[PDB]
Each structure stands twice: as C-alpha cells, then as structure tokens.
C-alpha cells in the first residue's frame, strides 16, 4: 500500500529534518577527476572516493558568491532536504562537508549523463519513452509534496539518467518545505507556472505545471514556450496558449491541457483527487505504478558506459581549481550546514 | 516550422535558473 509506504517515510524524513547530518567527510578524502557541469551558483566535479575506490559528483559552491547572489537560505534548504530524502529517484546525498571557502555536497553519480543531452541530440522522444521518465517524475513529486516539498526547478538539465536508465533528479537549490504559501520568483523561464510570474503566492502545484512542460519538451522536442529572452516567455506563459504538434496523442494532448492549466483550481495534481487525477490518465492507462517504483520495467534507452569514472555522457567544462583560503569566510551564516 | 523556429533561438543550450 501507498499510503503505508508515506507514513513511515515520512518518519524517517522527519528525523533527520529535525537532526541534520553534518561533516561527515572531508576534501582530502577525495580525487578530483573532472567538471561534469556548471552553475550560476556553483560546479559539478566527478570525484572518487580513494580508499573505497567509489565514484561520487561533488557540488561544490563558494560561500562567498553565494552571499553575493542572496542565496544563504535556499543553499541552506537544499543541503537539509537532501539529508533527509530517500527515494529510488532522487540522487542519493552520501557526504556533506565545508571549509574556510566552500561548501560541498557529495551526491551519486549517474554515468548516463543529463536527460537535456540525450533530448537534444535525439531531436524528441516517443511516447513511450516519454511515459517511462514521466512517470518516474510522478512519483518523484508525491512523495516529495507528501512531506510539504516543494521541488522548484523540474527541466531535463536536472534529470540524471542511472545506469539502468531511471532517473536521478538533482539540484535541490530552489527546493523548500512549505505548508501553504510561498512567493519567491525563482526557477527557470521556459517552466515557470503563471502564478509564479504573477507574483501571486503559489504552492506546491507550480510543480504539476512543470511536469506539463516537461512531458511537452520530452515529446515535441522543444518547449510549449519559447522565445529569445525571458520576457517574451513570460508573456506567452501567462496567455496560456499553447499549440500541441500534429504527432502527439489526444491522450497526451489531454493530459497536457490539465496540467497546463492557468486556473489552478482546474489545474490536475492540485484538485481534491490530487496526484491521482494524473495517475489514472489515459495517457499513464499502460503504466505499472509499482513495477516503474521497484525498477522492473525495463528502460527503453540504456545509456553506453565503459567502466566506472567514464564521463563520455557529459560535456567537456572548463576546469577551474579549488581555491581554499586561510581564513574562515561566512562562518555564522553557514553554521548549520 | 516550430521546430526550425525553435533551432533558430537564443535558448536551445543548457538553460540557467533566474534568482531573485
């Protein structure tokens, strides 16, 4: 049962909530390989683990550009829900650490690369496809919201694929435990639900609105909103057309038009049905819930790995070195990390 | 086409979240 499997993940979540991991390795421990990405706030590092031989990504940000940019609490709400979730689609947070310049977040590596890659290069995925990733993304967000998560930043560049070919969501930056509302203007254009914009206060049902975007980009190959620069997709975000390709589905055309849905009291995933509005959809009518949650269906794409530590999946970055000052900075606005 | 309208834009490379 469902609803038993929340209950006691929500125990465990609760826990570790109000007790957070802290320290628990250090930068000496592990050799760096090579920048898997970058980031507005910080880079992505392959690691390895010298005396177990194991493979991690490493998140490290530099306190001080993070207090330049305002993002202190946001940095400090993604460590702490990172500790405390469990779930077979979410990147697993093994260590957490910092020093006098940086903090730093050693997650599970996904050798299959970002989702965006593989999307971009393929053009556009099949239905099926499609299906497979949405409905991993499904469960992904209930059991994200049953613990009053709101996740933020949903888009392919934040979607792992694991060498079985499931996904891995990554970046916790803009995620936040809320019960009711919330108000900062933070995402990414292309997924921005109209409430967002509006300036409105929104809830957990901006989410659902990014999976409409998700499942269309995954489908159509490019995003229900688009345009040279942000302002003139937030115009078309709020008109809320949208024009569906002649190739999809009218069960997917269906299920798009309810989760692209302006007023969100019609909105689907935030009705009094909830995530089970979604999860009846015709469109998910093939979908074995609980085979995609034990990872027995098998994955349409596999991605080609050679060996542990290969990164042939990623894009090549500039590497920069870790600098690492004498002197503690930010020390009483990162204690808590 | 969209699609060639899309191939054309400013926005077909890694998209970086916007902050407050």
Same mark, same amino acid.
Do not use: C, R, V, W
């Given at each position: 049962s469902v609803k038993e499997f929340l209950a006691k993940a929500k125990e465990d979540f609760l826990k570790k909530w109000e007790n957070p991991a802290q *320290?628990?390795?250090?930068? $000496?421990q592990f050799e760096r390989i090579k920048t898997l990405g970058t980031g507005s706030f910080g880079r992505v590092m392959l690691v390895k683990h010298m005396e177990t031989g194991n493979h991690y990504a490493m998140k490290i940000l530099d306190k001080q550009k993070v207090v330049k940019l305002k993002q202190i609490e946001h940095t400090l709400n993604e460590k702490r829900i990172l500790q405390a979730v469990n779930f077979p689609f979410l990147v697993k947070l093994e260590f957490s650490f910092k020093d006098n310049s940086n903090l730093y977040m050693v997650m599970e590596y996904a #050798? +299959? +690369?970002?989702?965006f890659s593989h999307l971009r290069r393929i053009g556009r995925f099949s239905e099926p496809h499609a299906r497979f990733y949405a409905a991993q993304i499904v469960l992904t967000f209930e059991y994200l919201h049953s613990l009053?998560?709101?996740?933020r930043d949903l888009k392919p560049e934040n979607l792992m694929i694991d060498q079985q070919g499931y996904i891995k969501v990554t $970046?916790?930056?803009?995620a936040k435990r809320v019960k009711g509302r919330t108000w900062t203007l933070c995402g990414t254009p292309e997924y921005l639900a109209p409430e967002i914009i509006l300036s409105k206060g929104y809830n957990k049902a901006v989410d659902w609105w990014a999976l409409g975007v998700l499942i269309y980009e995954m489908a159509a190959?490019? #995003?229900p909103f688009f345009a040279d620069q942000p302002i003139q997709i937030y115009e078309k975000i709020v008109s809320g057309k949208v024009r569906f390709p002649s190739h999809f589905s009218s069960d997917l055309k269906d299920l798009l038009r309810n989760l692209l849905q302006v007023d969100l009291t019609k909105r689907f995933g935030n009705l009094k049905n909830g995530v089970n509005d979604i999860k009846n959809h015709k469109w998910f009518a093939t979908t074995d819930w609980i085979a995609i949650y034990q990872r027995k269906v098998e994955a349409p794409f596999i991605p080609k790995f050679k060996? #542990? +530590?290969?990164?042939? *999946?990623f894009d090549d970055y500039e590497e920069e070195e870790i600098r690492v000052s004498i002197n503690e900075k930010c020390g009483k606005e990162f204690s808590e990390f | 086409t969209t699609y060639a309208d899309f191939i054309a834009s400013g926005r077909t490379g890694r998209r970086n979240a916007i902050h407050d």
């Open positions: *320290n628990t390795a250090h930068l $000496d #050798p +299959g +690369g970002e989702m009053d998560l709101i996740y $970046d916790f930056g803009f190959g490019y #995003p060996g #542990p +530590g290969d990164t042939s *999946n | -």
